[PDB]
């Protein structure tokens, strides 16, 4: 939150999360309603950058097997 300017959201979530102490339907619906507030959109980018972001990475073998 401090990197992106959302500390007023993150601290607001943490201080409200710290008030539930029993496991019933209330604290469960809190989790449901908190998960609902994420934004479900479909990320759009060109295929010519989809390939050259996804298909250019490579694994790194720190301990290879010897010759």
């Amino acid at each position: 939150g401090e990197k992106y300017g959302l500390s007023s959201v993150v601290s607001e979530l943490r201080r409200r999360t710290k008030t539930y102490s029993k496991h019933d339907f209330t604290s469960v619906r809190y989790i449901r309603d908190a998960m609902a507030c994420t934004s479900g959109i479909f990320l759009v980018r060109t295929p010519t950058e989809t390939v050259l972001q996804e298909y250019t990475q490579s694994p790194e073998i720190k301990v290879p097997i010897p010759q």
Binding site: L43, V44, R45, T48, E49, L52, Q53
Partner: protein, 67 residues
């Protein structure tokens, strides 16, 4: 506007230059209205202009970025 966001790679394919992180390859947010010509039957609404896609099919540098 979008002139400082994209460029043309070697092998003449369009890319973008990223400003924050190497995964900044999505659609940026810029002013859009300067690349528009209005529809008939209603003045207020425009679409992508045909001259820019004509020059992009011809092989202009800026017109391919704009389309």
């Amino acid at each position: 506007s979008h002139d400082s966001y994209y460029y043309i790679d070697a092998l003449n394919r369009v890319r973008r230059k990223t400003y924050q992180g190497p995964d900044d390859v999505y659609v940026p947010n810029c002013s859009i209205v300067e690349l528009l010509e209005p529809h008939e039957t209603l003045t207020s609404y425009g679409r992508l202009s045909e001259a820019i896609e004509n020059r992009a099919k011809d092989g202009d540098s800026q017109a391919r970025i704009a389309t």
